[PDB]
Amino acid sequence: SLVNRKQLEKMANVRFRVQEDEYVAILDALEEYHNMSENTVVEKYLKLKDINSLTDTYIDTYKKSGRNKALKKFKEYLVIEILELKNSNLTPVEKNLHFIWIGGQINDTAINYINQWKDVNSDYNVNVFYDSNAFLINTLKKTIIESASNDTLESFRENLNDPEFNHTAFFRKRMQIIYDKQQNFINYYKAQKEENPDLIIDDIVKTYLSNEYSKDIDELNAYIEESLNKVTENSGNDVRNFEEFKTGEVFNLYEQELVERWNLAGASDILRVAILKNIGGVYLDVDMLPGIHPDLFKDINKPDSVKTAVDWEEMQLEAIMKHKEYIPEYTSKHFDTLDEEVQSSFESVLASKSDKSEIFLPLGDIEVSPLEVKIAFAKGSIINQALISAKDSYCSDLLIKQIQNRYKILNDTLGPIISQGNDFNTTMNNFGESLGAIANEENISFIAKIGSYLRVGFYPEANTTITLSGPTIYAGAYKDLLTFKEMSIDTSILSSELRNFEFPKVNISQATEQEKNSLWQFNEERAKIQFEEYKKNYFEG
Amino acid sequence: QLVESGGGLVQTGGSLRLSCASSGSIAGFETVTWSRQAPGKSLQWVASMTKTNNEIYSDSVKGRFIISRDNAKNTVYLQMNSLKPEDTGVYFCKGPELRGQGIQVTVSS
Ligand SMILES: O=c1ccn([C@@H]2O[C@H](COP(=O)(O)OP(=O)(O)O)[C@@H](O)[C@H]2O)c(=O)[nH]1
Ligand SMILES: OC[C@H]1O[C@H](O)[C@H](O)[C@@H](O)[C@@H]1O
Ligand SMILES: [Mg+2]
Ligand SMILES: [Mn+2]
């Protein structure tokens, strides 16, 4: 518990020094903090912020004060109090499970994972957020990527069998053409919206696809119908009915990611934040599965031939799916390598439990601080595939401010460069120069990581999304919280402190088949495989 | 070079605007603390304004009092509305190196 007035007085006592007015400001505000029985968690938090500011003011006023040593210690005590506040005063989490599938038709695989949460959480309300205006984003991205692939292979036809013509070289050249086509669509979209603001995204996309790629509008219309119908019959909740989001200050950034970038993961990073702020509950990625019941496999010890908690968990999920078949076509690739004696322990225990709620642990009643968002860990790092927040949580509002600030810096740097209408390489070189000019000691961690924004989803390990709206904004928000600031762009924080915000591990299985299949980025390995396949297909192997 | 005014006697419910104006310093009030002392009580904090133009209010006074500065940060104001007899006392404005002699405030009831 935080020192009271008299305890601070003993700490910051300097013999013969009269109590300055700026000191009394601190002592009186600390006393007021301790008389806040009746106040909300955020009110208490804002009182701590006040004490912090008064403390900073004192230190700045009397730079050589004998009190300063104690006051700087006091400032650290304020941070301890935040965590106490956070960890001591919990409200129940609204019993909502929130999922997002935007940009195209929800796949049967996503449905089947979702259904597992539904089956063991009958007391939870389920929303799968979609966007009834943008079912064709995936079609548009796929079409444009394939067209640029073909153009690239055509253009470099005689270099294809050249020892030195890399997968790297292919993707580098293809990127230039993708940018051209993406910019072509983007400018068409903006012109169309000016001419007729009543048009929806899918109106413009299907026209574009028909005009430029001779796609059949009847088949596109039929796909929209199927997609709408599939999601509606599966707890569909239309983003276009989400008023607080639509009229809020990050709707434009969401549409940027959806319509300009074709980054559905990035758009979903933004949506998920608005969902937890405005509604609250539990956000999950569609590749997440419920926690395995802790006493299902307690009595089977991990073979030494398996040397990570993740591979073990992976094994356990495949056992459930092999023997219970809850999800059709779930891999058993890893489970099969197991010794027959171990596999037999698995099938024997699964034969005994005959009720899904004894296989998967129901969430039940979860509680969170009104200050915070809870986030999952992986690889000792935070990852926003799973989130817990009460409606209007404080960290929730910090998250939106992180998003606004990050996109403001990006768009104000990148936007005027793009509008000069230069090619990808020129645009990119100029972007690089601009990033160099606006770089300072504060923003550098951010500036060093946004250079590849235009490559996202088209180039191996184009990662920018992490910094824009992913795990980085959460580290930023928690730093905000713990430093009494907002829009922190330097997100240095102890891993100790981050552990205070950890999503309860018992409540998720992260090591699913689908988690291994990233839908927004690809690595070098995958890049090499795609390239060989592009070549073969182009030559008609 | 500091001129204090705005005080006096009001009935319960009335308003006053305290004013401290300085001259002869670059922002003599770039940090300002308002304090008050009743007879037989200790000096009590009322409100503060940081170098960031951040306004911090004591709980007993929030929703009634407004602290403000001119852009030169040489004169500071304390708008005090819905005054109670509780508010009665001598008010002091404090900058980094300036401090007023005190403005008497009396609320009648
Ligand atoms: O076409 C897409 C692709 C992705 N997503 C969203 O992006 C999230 C993250 O996708 P993924 O698990 O592939 O990202 P990773 O975990 O690999 O970063 C998903 O749960 C979806 O909510 C989407 O709505 N539509
Ligand atoms: O930040 C971009 C993406 O990467 C994250 O690590 C999460 O797995 C995913 O949900 C998110 O959309
Ligand atoms: Mg996935
Ligand atoms: Mn994933």
User: Residue A495 burial (CB < 10 Å; 0-12/13-18/19+)?
Assistant: exposed
CA–CA dist A122, A116 (Å, integer): 11
Does any CB of chain B come closer than 8 Å to the CB of residue A31?
no
CA–CA–CA angle A309, A311, A316 (5° rounding): 90
User: Residue A214 burial (CB < 10 Å; 0-12/13-18/19+)?
Assistant: exposed
Helices (H), A258-393: 264-278, 309-324, 333-336, 340-352, 356-359
Closest CA to A350 of A314, A398, A316, A387: A316
Sequence letter at residue A180: D
Domain count within chain B:
1
Rounded to the nearest angstrom, the distance between the alpha carbon of A285 and the centre of ligand 4 is 6
A18 sits in the region (left: phi over 0; alpha: psi -120 to 50; else beta) called beta
CA–CA dist A232, A238 (Å, integer): 9
CA–CA dist A52, A95 (Å, integer): 35
Residues 6+ apart with CB under 8 A from A429: none
What are the structural domains of chain A? 4-89 (1.20.58.1190), 90-291+362-541 (no CATH), 292-361 (1.10.10.1780)
Method: X-ray
Label each residue of A16-83 as H, E or C: CCCCCHHHHHHHHHHHHHHCCCCCCHHHHHHHHHHHHHHHHHHHHHCCCCCCHHHHHHHHHHHHHHHH
CA–CA dist A373, A375 (Å, integer): 6
CA–CA dist A169, A173 (Å, integer): 6
Sequence letter at residue A511: A
* Residues A400 and A250: beta-carbon distance below 8 Å: yes
CA–CA dist A155, B29 (Å, integer): 69
CA–CA dist B41, B88 (Å, integer): 11
Question: What's the resolution in A?
Answer: 2.4
Closest CA to A540 of A153, A98, A143: A153
* Residues B100 and B3: beta-carbon distance below 8 Å: no
Residue with tokens 């009110």: A43
Label each residue of A422-469 as H, E or C: CCHHHHHHHHHHHHHHCCCCCCHHHHCCCCCHHHCCCCCCCCCHHHHC
Q: Which ligand 1 atom sits closest to the C-alpha of A514?
A: 12
Token representation of residue A305:
């031939």
Q: Do A28 and B45 touch (CB under 8 A)?
A: yes
Q: Do B54 and A29 touch (CB under 8 A)?
A: no
* Residues B48 and A54: beta-carbon distance below 8 Å: yes
Q: Do B56 and A54 touch (CB under 8 A)?
A: yes
CA–CA dist A29, A54 (Å, integer): 8
Sequence letter at residue A385: Q
* Residues A334 and A311: beta-carbon distance below 8 Å: yes
Sequence letter at residue A46: L
CA–CA dist B108, A229 (Å, integer): 72
Q: Whose CA is nearest to atom 2 of ligand 1?
A: A264
A470 in contact with ligand 1, CB cutoff 6 A: no
Residue with tokens 């770039």: B30
* Residues A282 and A98: beta-carbon distance below 8 Å: yes
Pairing state between β B103-107 and B8-10:
parallel
* Residues A234 and A128: beta-carbon distance below 8 Å: yes
Q: Where are the beta strands (DSSP E) in A47-202?
A: 91-92, 96-100, 125-130
Provide the domain limits for residue B3.
Answer: 1-109
CA–CA dist B20, B1 (Å, integer): 10
